[PDB]
């Protein structure tokens, strides 16, 4: 009852977390092709947003396909005679999520915020952590990475990677590595996540980023 609703709610949250991550990386390739220019009115942005929200092809990378997967679970709840109010509540969450994405993807400022957040996630993942729990490692580092509002503007047609990846990679080794002989971080590095190494990491990442942003 509450157990079946909790499981579908958690599955919906997994669907949305994976789809929102993917959607912004896919939209980022349109921005990359425009060398970091944001303009929700362009032909390429309008088509990218429409197709990744609304493609109806079976197996599509689209919010419409995610919605199909969620419809399977809500139908199963109704088959199991779960209270209609609890099932409707799941359906309204999904409608909320669509409405919220449809508003954000046609707002230049909301697009910038989505892309800057994904840049941050990609740069956290560039840190060469080969230890046991990479999600918990990145959760500890995340509060010490503050990216500028114009981070999206550094996506260029000619670049394989956003340049912030190299900055987090190198600063993480400088402040958290257990030795100069190890080119990577692991469980032995975790003792190096003191307030002292983390604050210094923060300051050094901010300075390397500022130097990059102000390069003539």
């Amino acid at each position: 009852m509450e157990r079946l609703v909790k499981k579908v709610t958690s599955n919906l949250e997994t669907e949305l977390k994976f789809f929102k991550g993917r959607l912004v990386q896919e939209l980022m390739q349109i921005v990359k092709n425009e060398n970091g220019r944001i303009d929700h009115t362009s032909k390429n942005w309008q088509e990218s947003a429409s197709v990744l929200l609304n493609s109806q092809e079976k197996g599509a990378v689209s919010l419409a396909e995610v919605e199909r997967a969620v419809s399977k679970m809500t139908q199963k709840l109704r088959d199991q005679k779960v209270s209609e109010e609890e099932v409707v509540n799941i359906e309204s969450k999904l409608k909320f999520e669509r409405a919220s994405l449809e508003a954000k993807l046609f707002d230049d400022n909301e697009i910038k915020e989505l892309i800057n957040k994904r840049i941050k996630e990609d740069a956290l993942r560039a840190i060469p952590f080969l230890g046991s729990d990479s999600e918990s490692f990145m959760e500890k580092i995340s509060p010490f990475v503050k990216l500028p509002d114009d981070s999206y503007s550094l996506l260029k047609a000619n670049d394989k990677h956003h340049p912030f990846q190299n900055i987090l990679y190198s600063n993480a080794l400088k402040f958290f590595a257990d030795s100069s002989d190890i080119g990577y971080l692991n469980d032995d590095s975790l003792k190096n996540l003191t307030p002292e190494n983390l604050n210094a990491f923060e300051q050094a990442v901010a300075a390397d980023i500022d130097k990059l942003m102000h390069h003539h």
Binding site: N11, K17, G21, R22, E26, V61, P128
Partner: protein, 178 residues
């Protein structure tokens, strides 16, 4: 920062999401698998050195044909995937994916990947395809297609059992180091 960009292309029969989720999470069979992979990198150990393995699924739907190629710049290695239990997905390797990849990336190494290896000898799946005048793709058929498209390797894997799964990514990395 040693960084590899690995791009995955293939039809919806393929299970591109399960392939990438299974490799990056080693989730137990039975766990909830989302509709799409989120295209985040994985750090992997190669000869005592960290390698950032960028893993991108592409939006395979035909209405993304015009924009899908914006995913392809600076790609180090392509995995062109088909399902071993979908002959249509296998013919789309040479009819669609190989020409599309080659249009944009003439020289980038290709690995040909057959997925759903666990179904090729599932009694109910062999029975199902039988009823439609079909047969699963055999190893030699896959090898022939790999030669036809000039793939550097042909590999077969199961997302479900992880048979062949590590080798796909190991070979993808090896193909870029050459």
């Amino acid at each position: 920062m040693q960084a590899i960009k690995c791009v995955v292309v293939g039809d919806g029969a393929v299970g591109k999401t399960c392939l990438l989720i299974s490799y990056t999470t080693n989730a137990f069979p039975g766990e909830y698998i989302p509709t799409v992979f989120d295209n985040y990198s994985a750090n992997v150990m190669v000869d005592g050195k960290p390698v950032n393995l960028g893993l991108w699924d592409t939006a395979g739907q035909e209405d993304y044909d015009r924009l899908r190629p914006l995913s392809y710049p600076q790609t180090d290695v392509f995995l062109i995937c088909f399902s071993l239990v979908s002959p249509a997905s296998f013919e789309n390797v040479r009819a669609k994916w190989y020409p599309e990849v080659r249009h944009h990336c003439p020289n980038t190494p290709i690995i040909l990947v057959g997925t759903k290896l666990d179904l090729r000898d599932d009694k109910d799946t062999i029975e199902k395809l039988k009823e439609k005048k079909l047969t699963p793709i055999t190893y030699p058929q896959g090898l022939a297609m790999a030669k036809e498209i000039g793939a550097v390797k042909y590999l077969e894997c199961s997302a479900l059992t992880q048979r062949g799964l590590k080798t796909v990514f190991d070979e993808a990395i090896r193909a870029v180091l050459h």
